[PDB]
Each structure stands twice: as C-alpha cells, then as structure tokens.
Design an enzyme around this catalytic site. Structure first.
Site, PDB file in Angstrom:
ATOM      1  N   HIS A 219       0.839  -1.229   0.000  1.00 44.46           N
ATOM      2  CA  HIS A 219       0.000   0.000   0.000  1.00 44.46           C
ATOM      3  C   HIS A 219       0.855   1.252   0.000  1.00 44.46           C
ATOM      4  O   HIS A 219       0.655   2.180  -0.825  1.00 44.46           O
ATOM      5  CB  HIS A 219      -0.966  -0.011   1.187  1.00 44.46           C
ATOM      6  CG  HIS A 219      -1.928   1.148   1.212  1.00 44.46           C
ATOM      7  ND1 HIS A 219      -1.548   2.439   1.543  1.00 44.46           N
ATOM      8  CD2 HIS A 219      -3.267   1.203   0.984  1.00 44.46           C
ATOM      9  CE1 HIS A 219      -2.603   3.240   1.493  1.00 44.46           C
ATOM     10  NE2 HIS A 219      -3.656   2.516   1.157  1.00 44.46           N
ATOM     11  N   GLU A 223       1.083   3.619  -3.321  1.00 43.64           N
ATOM     12  CA  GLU A 223       0.613   5.003  -3.239  1.00 43.64           C
ATOM     13  C   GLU A 223       1.700   6.034  -3.528  1.00 43.64           C
ATOM     14  O   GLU A 223       1.452   7.049  -4.237  1.00 43.64           O
ATOM     15  CB  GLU A 223      -0.093   5.321  -1.917  1.00 43.64           C
ATOM     16  CG  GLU A 223      -1.393   4.518  -1.724  1.00 43.64           C
ATOM     17  CD  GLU A 223      -2.510   4.983  -2.682  1.00 43.64           C
ATOM     18  OE1 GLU A 223      -2.524   6.185  -3.076  1.00 43.64           O
ATOM     19  OE2 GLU A 223      -3.336   4.146  -3.016  1.00 43.64           O
ATOM     20  N   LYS A 226       2.350   6.187  -7.338  1.00 39.77           N
ATOM     21  CA  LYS A 226       1.298   6.989  -7.999  1.00 39.77           C
ATOM     22  C   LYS A 226       1.573   8.480  -7.865  1.00 39.77           C
ATOM     23  O   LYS A 226       1.429   9.223  -8.835  1.00 39.77           O
ATOM     24  CB  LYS A 226      -0.082   6.593  -7.453  1.00 39.77           C
ATOM     25  CG  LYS A 226      -0.556   5.341  -8.125  1.00 39.77           C
ATOM     26  CD  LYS A 226      -1.632   4.593  -7.423  1.00 39.77           C
ATOM     27  CE  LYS A 226      -2.638   5.428  -6.723  1.00 39.77           C
ATOM     28  NZ  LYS A 226      -3.488   4.594  -5.836  1.00 39.77           N
ATOM     29  N   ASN A 227       2.005   8.896  -6.665  1.00 35.43           N
ATOM     30  CA  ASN A 227       2.287  10.279  -6.373  1.00 35.43           C
ATOM     31  C   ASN A 227       3.493  10.754  -7.161  1.00 35.43           C
ATOM     32  O   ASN A 227       3.492  11.886  -7.696  1.00 35.43           O
ATOM     33  CB  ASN A 227       2.560  10.446  -4.878  1.00 35.43           C
ATOM     34  CG  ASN A 227       2.993  11.869  -4.501  1.00 35.43           C
ATOM     35  OD1 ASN A 227       2.194  12.814  -4.582  1.00 35.43           O
ATOM     36  ND2 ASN A 227       4.264  12.026  -4.059  1.00 35.43           N
TER      37      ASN A 227
END
Ligand SMILES: [K+]
Ligand SMILES: [K+]
Lengths: 365, 365
Positions: A219, A223, A226-227
């Site tokens: 996770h 995440e 993606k950022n």
C-alpha cells in the site's frame, strides 16, 4: 444502554502488541479468544467515544452514521461473550464466526468514512477542521489495528496470518511499481521507468527481508509511486521525455528505509503537508459510468493512510521536496520485530481536551 | 527595581520585521532610534523573563549569571532614553554609541551561554531538560534577532547593513565548502570533493540570487559541510576512498532550497534529532594548549543554531538519513523578501506554562 457499554470499555486502554508477539502467537484458538473478547470491545469503544465528538454536521452524514452503526453492532455482538466459558467449545467457535462476520461487515469502513467527509464538505469550517484532521488519523490508525486483529484471528482459526516472517522487500516494491505504472500508462499514455538500487548494510549482497505485513508495505509503495508518477507526467508533459523514478532500499542495524525520488517539479514547503491533510485531499469519487481513465491522485486518502501504515509499527513516512526540481519520499520501517510495536490511539481526558481546546508563545506571521 | 523594568517591557510583544522592511529602511537615524528605544528593551525584557525560569542549578552557573548581567546592564542603558527627545541630536548620537557598546558587550553571548550548559551538566535531570531545550531555541533565536537589530543600526549609522539584496548563493556555498574542507584536511588528513549543481527554475541558466544575510547562509552551509564531512571520513576510513559531498541548489517560485547529500553511513530515525538537542550535543571546548586538530563536531551548537538561522526568516533546515547509507540535509529559504519575516519568541502565559506543565492520547511504546 449502548452508552453504558461504550463507557465501560472506553475506560480501558488498548493493549499494543509487538510484531514478535503477533508472530510468536500464530507460530491456540482459546488464547486468542481470551485476549480478543476484551481487546476488541476495548478498541471499538475507545474510538466510538471520539466518533461522538465529531462536528455535528459530519457525525450526522449518512456515511458516518452507517460506520457508527457497524461499530455499535459489532461491539454488541462481541459483548455477548464476556460471560462465556473459555472451556465451552461452541463459545470458541461462535467467537471465531463472530470475528469473521465483523471482518466482512467492516470491509468498506475506510471509503465509507471518506464518503462521510465528502458529504460534510459538500453540504456545509476552519476551527473544527483541526478536529477532523485529529480524528481521522486516530480513527484510521484504530481501524488498521482492529483489522490486523480480525485478520490474524480469521486467517489462523478460520505466512503467519497476514505476517510474512521473510518479507521480500524488493519484490513488493516491484509489484507496487508495476501496478502504479499500469494506471499511469492508462491516464498519461506514458510512464517513467524504475531504477531500483539496494544496500544490505547489515550483511552486504544478501537479500533484504524483514518480518512485516506485505500488504501494508505494498500500500505504501504503490501510493507513493502513484504520487511520484503523477508529478513526473504533469511536470515534463511539454518535453515528452520522462525521468525515471529512482528507488533506493537500505537495510541498516535498526531501520529498513525505502527512498523514492522523482523529478516531478516539487512543491514548496508551505504546501507539502497538504498531501497528508484529509480535508484538502477530500475529492468526490470518479463516476462508475465512464471509460475515462482514473486519475493517479484523488479519492480515498492513499497518502495520509500510507503514512499511518508506516507509523502503525513505529515506522514513519516523510516527504521532502525541492520546489522547481523534484521530491523524495522516505518510508522508515523498524528492521527488528521486537521494535515493531502497535501505535494505538487511546480515549481519555487528553484525547477529549484535543476536541475541546483552542496566545501562542511565538509571534504571528 | 530591575524586576519592575523587566516586567513593564515583557508585557509587550516583540514586533517582527520583514526582510523587505529591513531593506526598505536601510536603503534615517531618528526613525531607527524611535523604533529601537522601545523594541530593544521589549526583546531584552521578554527573554530575561525566561532566563529566570531556568533550573536553579543552570541559572546559578557563572556563565549564565554573566550573560544575565550583560542583559540587565544593556536593558538599563537603553531605558535611559525613553524620555529623551527624538529631536535632541545628542540623544540620537548617544543612542548610536549605546547600540555599539551593547553590540560589543554581547559579542560572546552564544558561547558563554553554551559554557553555562557545560557547567550545569558538569556539576549536576530528564524533566527540566525539556525546559532546557525549549529555552535555548528561544534564547538563541531571540539573540539572533537582537544581533540583527544591533548590526543594522551599527552598520547604517555607526549591502544594506548586513543584508545583501543580491546574495550570490553558490559563491557563499563554495566559501562554506572551502573553509569546512580546510578543517577536514587538518583532522582526517583527507577530505571529500564537492559536486555542485544548480537549477534556476524561476529563470533557467541565470545566476541564483536572493535578498539575504550572507553570514547567516554561510553559517548554515559551513556547519552542514562539517557534519557531512565528519560522517563521510569516519564511515569510509577503512576504504580510504571518500565519496564527494553533492550539493543541489534550486530556486523555485517560493523556495530557495539547498540540498547537501553525503554517503557518511547515516543515522537511524530514533537518533537523528539528537543532532538538534542542546543537552546531547553539549561537549567541553577543546583546550587551547594543544597543536592537535580541532574535531568537526563538538562545542558550540553549530547545527541547532544553523536551523534557528533558517527558521529566523520563515525558512527551515531538515535532515533525513538512510541508516547504513548516508544523509541529506535541506536548507529552505523564502525566495521573496516579503515572505521573509522575523520569527520571534514572546513571553506570556503560554511561554510560562511550557516551563511549568507536564496521560497521553496515544499508547506508550
Ligand atoms: K481509554
Ligand atoms: K510579552
């Protein structure tokens, strides 16, 4: 009635476990029952007190009311066992069935609470908004801890539960990268490459493994990728040449660290904490009825929740950015399972005062 | 008597100036007098109240008593002017003479206070040690602000004072590097090279300049270079091959950032804040009577004071380290002189409560 039960159990403090204890146990159903028939009501009751302190316009939303009704029902179901006998086998079996039912009921607690915040924001404040930030960090950390306990019992009595004693860090990173990359390609029609470097300082050239919950690590890295990818694709969109994302993994005496570096143009220091602010990052869910690609930032609090996952076992997740250039995100994880201890919120006078208090000792700018 | 004067002026809040105001003024002696005959007593009195709240065994040290006696004398000398006439020219002249005398008297305030902490530590606590950390950040920031006001008035009435409206950032960095390198060569008989990179994102290929106090920027970079060099020379001492220190300078819309990266083996997250803790970094001064080279870490609080310099004008200085690998130190400075506003401590009920207050809302690890 329900207030009474909540008040009784909220008096207690949650009891944090270390990763070593989670593992030592997993690698006796009755022992788990004894622990959990007290601990789950305690953890539920402590957080339910703080749900009641929310701004009225947030508490009243249908999403928050639904989450609260789930908690009330699960609390009541668990409290049916307080007087039962550890030695009566049905009591044991029904506890395990009740753990599974609750686990399912609570599956969508995170997006349902987030929808509550959308409803609040949509329909209606700077003062109580500090209360919202304080609550959601605690509510989501609480939920992470509750889900951990439910997953361990369900997996063991329904890899050591969800814990992998030999979590292959670079493998999880590459999985994170490939799934983020897929979404990037879908939205921006291109994506940055990965450059991955490792140092096992502890013992050089050996695989980097730790005792950890792989889905937590996944996770966080997914995440952050993606950022990193969003910033990179938006920043270099004119050039059409996209610098790779560079990931450096180090295993030290005490810290496993994962540094993720991008050339996405950065963010000034004044703004960078916004990425962890629930109210600022509260955006409507995309509609189901479209074939248009889903953006790499938006609904569901991926970043503040990634940081909670890191902090849940005494790690951390920090960002630092050079405005005009790019950003480094660092995940810190405890290398040793004995240092990995649950970080748990507790309801008491100090928690309450936080909802109910606010000249500074420094001059205003 | 003296208590009365201190109490009168400590009621007031210090008045922070922006860099633009410092500059706008410099580029009228009477205007400065009007401002300073109130502001200097205010700043002196506010911090003198907190000196009185120190642990008795610290306050009683001869070094702290001496610093306090300097403050008392300077306060009294300044208060001789409160009733004088802005229009009487001698009053003006003596104010300027009094500003110069105070500036000289207070020249060694920073190491004298630091010697006070050595005397305290040497002769005698975890509780009051939080009080020491709180005080010294405020005392030294106060001193930075007081010295700024004294320097501006003394330079202007005795480059805009000490401010350079076109501070050449890379030049100051290279000066910092060369002076740190000299000390490194003296202690470790070798030193890492510098690799310096810049990006003027604001306008590419143009020199990076800001409105700033060059000696403040020099202090920060020189101290960080020493820190980077120490770690690098101690870490790679067996190999005898020393990785360079890499410095990346970015000018963004809002932030000037200076990132300094070393391969000195890093520090775990649990320990890294120690570098900013006064009590942990309190070490006896080297003796004068030796030709042995002075170490690159030790007496005088170079690092916590570097961070105060950054924060003094709404910037910051942050460290993040990957244990087993190396460390990045980042200086953040406001690119715009209108965003650069003094960060000043103020004495009031909130400050007092900090010396006089201490269950948590999270579970103990
Ligand atoms: K409690
Ligand atoms: K005051």
């Amino acid at each position: 009635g329900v207030p009474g039960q909540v008040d009784f159990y909220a008096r207690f403090s949650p009891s944090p476990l270390s990763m070593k204890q989670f593992l030592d146990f997993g690698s006796c159903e009755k022992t788990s029952f004894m622990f959990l028939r007290q601990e789950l009501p305690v953890r539920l009751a402590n957080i339910m007190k703080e749900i009641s302190l929310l701004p009225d316009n947030l508490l009243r939303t249908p999403s928050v009311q639904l989450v609260q009704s789930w908690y009330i029902q699960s609390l009541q179901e668990l409290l049916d066992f307080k007087d039962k006998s550890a030695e009566d086998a049905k009591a044991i079996y029904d506890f395990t069935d009740t753990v599974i039912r609750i686990r399912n009921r609570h599956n969508d607690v995170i997006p349902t609470m987030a929808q509550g915040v959308i409803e609040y924001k949509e329909s209606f404040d700077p003062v109580t908004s500090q209360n919202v930030q304080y609550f959601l960090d605690r509510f989501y950390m609480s939920r992470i801890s509750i889900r951990m306990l439910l997953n361990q019992h369900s997996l063991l009595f329904g890899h050591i539960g969800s814990i992998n004693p030999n979590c292959n860090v670079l493998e999880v990173i590459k999985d994170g990268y490939e799934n983020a990359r897929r979404l990037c390609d879908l939205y921006y029609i291109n994506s940055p490459e990965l450059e991955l470097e490792e140092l096992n300082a502890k013992s050089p050239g050996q695989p980097i493994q730790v005792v950890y919950v792989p889905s937590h690590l996944y996770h966080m890295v997914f995440e952050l990728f993606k950022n990193a990818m969003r910033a990179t694709m938006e920043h270099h969109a004119n050039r059409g040449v996209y610098p790779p994302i560079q990931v450096h993994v180090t295993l030290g005496n005490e810290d496993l660290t994962v540094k993720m570096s991008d050339r996405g143009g950065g963010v000034p220091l004044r703004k960078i904490d916004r990425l962890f602010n629930y109210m600022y990052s509260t955006a409507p869910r995309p509609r189901v009825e479209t074939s248009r690609a889903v953006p790499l930032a938006g609904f569901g609090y991926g970043l503040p929740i990634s940081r909670l996952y890191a902090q849940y076992f005494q790690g951390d997740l920090k960002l630092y950015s050079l405005e005009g250039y790019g950003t480094d995100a660092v995940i810190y994880i405890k290398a040793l399972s004995t240092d990995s201890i649950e970080r748990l919120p507790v309801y008491n006078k100090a928690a309450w005062k936080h909802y109910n208090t606010n000249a500074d000792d420094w001059c205003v700018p």
